Design an enzyme around this catalytic site. Structure first.
Site, PDB file in Angstrom:
ATOM      1  N   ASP A   1     -13.788  -4.532   7.443  1.00  0.00           N
ATOM      2  CA  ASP A   1     -13.455  -4.701   6.018  1.00  0.00           C
ATOM      3  C   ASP A   1     -13.559  -6.184   5.561  1.00  0.00           C
ATOM      4  OD1 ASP A   1     -12.757  -3.900   3.377  1.00  0.00           O
ATOM      5  OD2 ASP A   1     -10.668  -3.376   3.859  1.00  0.00           O
TER       6      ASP A   1
ATOM      7  N   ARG B   1     -11.409 -10.528  -0.686  1.00  0.00           N
ATOM      8  CA  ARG B   1     -10.026 -10.034  -0.812  1.00  0.00           C
ATOM      9  C   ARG B   1      -9.275 -10.116   0.548  1.00  0.00           C
ATOM     10  NH1 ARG B   1     -13.429  -5.619  -1.628  1.00  0.00           N
ATOM     11  NH2 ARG B   1     -13.589  -4.316   0.255  1.00  0.00           N
ATOM     12  N   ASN B   2     -10.017 -10.216   1.682  1.00  0.00           N
ATOM     13  CA  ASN B   2      -9.445 -10.309   3.041  1.00  0.00           C
ATOM     14  C   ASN B   2      -9.632 -11.694   3.670  1.00  0.00           C
ATOM     15  OD1 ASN B   2      -8.059  -7.856   3.488  1.00  0.00           O
ATOM     16  ND2 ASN B   2      -9.938  -6.770   3.987  1.00  0.00           N
TER      17      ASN B   2
ATOM     18  N   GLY C   1       0.841  -1.186   0.000  1.00  0.00           N
ATOM     19  CA  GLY C   1       0.000   0.000   0.000  1.00  0.00           C
ATOM     20  C   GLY C   1       0.878   1.237   0.000  1.00  0.00           C
TER      21      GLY C   1
END
Ligand SMILES: CCn1cc(CC(=O)Nc2ccc(Oc3ncnc4cc(OC)c(OC)cc34)cc2)cn1
Length: 305
Positions: free
Chosen positions: A166, A170-171, A32
Site C-alpha cells: 500500500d 497517504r502512507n 478505521g
C-alpha cells in the site's frame, strides 16, 4: 497477507515491553472500522525522568480474531526490522495485562499527502529568497529529497524481504529537518469512506496505485511495490493531486491499463523523474528498476543539481 516472510513465525523481543499505566492518551489521530492511532505521553521511556510524545496503535471493541492477529504480526515485523531513519520506528509495546498496544515515534507534520496539498499555493520551482526563508516555502529541491528518502526506505524493506502492498503519499509521514518516514496506517484508516479505495470483489483496494499482476492475479512482489512508487512520484510532482484525474475505476479503466495506457508527466516533474515513472510502469515486472537502482539514479540527479 505477507508474500516471502510469514510474520506469525517471527519472534517478539521482550526488551520492547513497556508498562501501560505509564501511558496517558490524548486525541485520536486516525481511525478505521477496527483500529485507531492515538497521540500519547510516555513517562519513563527516556533515561532521565523526562516525558515524551508518542503515537499508539490499538484495536477498537469492534475488532475480531483476524484483526487481533494482524496487529500482533505488525509488532513482530517492526521488532524484526530494527531502526531505519526512513521508516517509522518501534519504541515499545504492551502485550501483557490487556489489549495489545504498539508504540511508535511521533511525526510532527503528519502525512505527506495533506502536507503537499497545504503547500500547493506556496511552491517555488526555483530558489527561495533569504528574507522569505521564515515563511517555509516548498521547492523542487525538497521534492527530489523526498523521492530519494522514500526510495532509500523501500530499498531497506526489500533487503529484509518485506513487501509494503500500500505504498502511497497517504502512507508517508513527515517529521523535523524535512525527514520522510514510510508508514502503514492499516487498520487505523477509514478505507470505506476514502474514495482512493475501490470495491473489487469482497475487498476495498487502492486500484489506482496497483500493478496489473496485483489487480488481475492477486500477486504482490518486490516489483509490484516499484509500480506503486511510480504512482507516488506522480502524486509528489503534482503536489498531491489524485492519479488518473477525471477517470473512474470501471471496466474502461481495467482495459486501458492492460492495453498500455499510462499517465503523462505531472506539471512539476523534471524529465529524468518522469523517465523513472515510465520504467516503474513497465508491463513486464522484470523490466522495472529495483529500489537500489532508483536510489543511485536520484543520487546522480541531486549531485548534478
Ligand atoms: C513500513 C513499516 N511499517 C510500519 C508500520 C506501523 C505504522 O506505520 N503505524 C503507524 C502509522 C501512522 C501513525 O500515525 C502517526 N504516527 C506518528 N505521528 C503522527 C502525526 C500525525 O499528525 C501530526 C498523524 O496525523 C494523522 C498521524 C501520526 C501511527 C502508527 C507498519 N509497517
Amino acid at each position: 497477507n505477507y508474500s516471502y516472510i510469514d510474520p506469525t513465525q517471527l519472534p517478539y523481543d521482550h526488551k520492547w515491553e513497556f508498562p501501560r499505566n505509564r501511558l496517558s492518551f490524548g486525541k485520536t489521530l486516525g481511525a478505521g472500522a477496527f483500529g485507531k492511532v492515538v497521540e500519547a505521553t510516555a513517562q519513563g521511556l527516556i533515561k532521565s525522568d523526562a516525558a515524551m510524545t508518542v503515537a499508539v496503535k490499538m484495536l477498537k471493541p469492534s475488532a475480531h480474531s483476524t484483526e487481533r492477529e494482524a496487529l500482533m504480526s505488525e509488532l513482530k515485523v517492526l521488532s524484526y526490522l530494527g531502526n531505519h531513519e526512513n521508516i517509522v520506528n518501534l519504541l515499545g509495546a504492551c502485550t501483557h495485562g490487556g489489549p495489545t498496544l504498539v508504540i511508535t515515534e511521533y511525526c510532527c507534520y503528519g502525512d505527506l499527502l495533506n502536507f503537499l496539498r497545504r503547500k500547493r499555493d506556496e511552491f517555488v520551482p526555483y530558489k527561495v529568497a533569504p528574507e522569505d526563508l521564515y515563511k517555509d516555502f516548498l521547492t523542487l529541491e525538497h521534492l527530489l529529497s523526498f523521492s530519494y528518502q522514500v526510495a532509500k526506505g523501500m530499498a531497506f524493506l526489500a533487503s529484509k524481504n518485506c513487501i509494503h502492498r500500500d505504498l502511497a503519499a497517504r502512507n508517508i509521514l513527515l517529521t523535523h529537518g524535512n525527514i520522510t518516514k514510510i508508514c502503514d496506517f492499516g487498520l487505523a484508516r477509514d478505507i470505506k469512506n476514502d474514495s482512493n479505495y475501490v470495491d473489487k470483489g469482497n475487498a476495498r483496494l487502492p486500484v489506482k496505485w496497483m500493478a496489473p499482476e496485483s489487480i488481475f492475479n492477486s500477486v504482490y512482489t518486490f516489483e509490484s511495490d516499484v509500480w506503486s512508487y511510480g504512482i507516488f512520484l506522480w502524486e509528489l510532482f503534482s503536489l498531491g493531486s489524485s492519479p488518473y484525474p477525471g477517470m473512474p475505476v470501471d471496466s474502461k479503466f481495467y482495459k486501458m491499463i492492460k492495453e498500455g495506457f499510462r499517465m503523462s508527466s505531472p506539471e512539476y516533474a523534471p524529465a529524468e523523474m518522469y523517465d523513472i515513472m515510465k520504467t516503474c510502469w513497465d508491463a513486464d515486472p522484470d523490466k522495472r528498476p529495483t529500489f537500489k537502482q532508483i536510489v543511485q539514479d536520484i543520487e546522480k540527479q541531486i549531485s548534478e543539481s
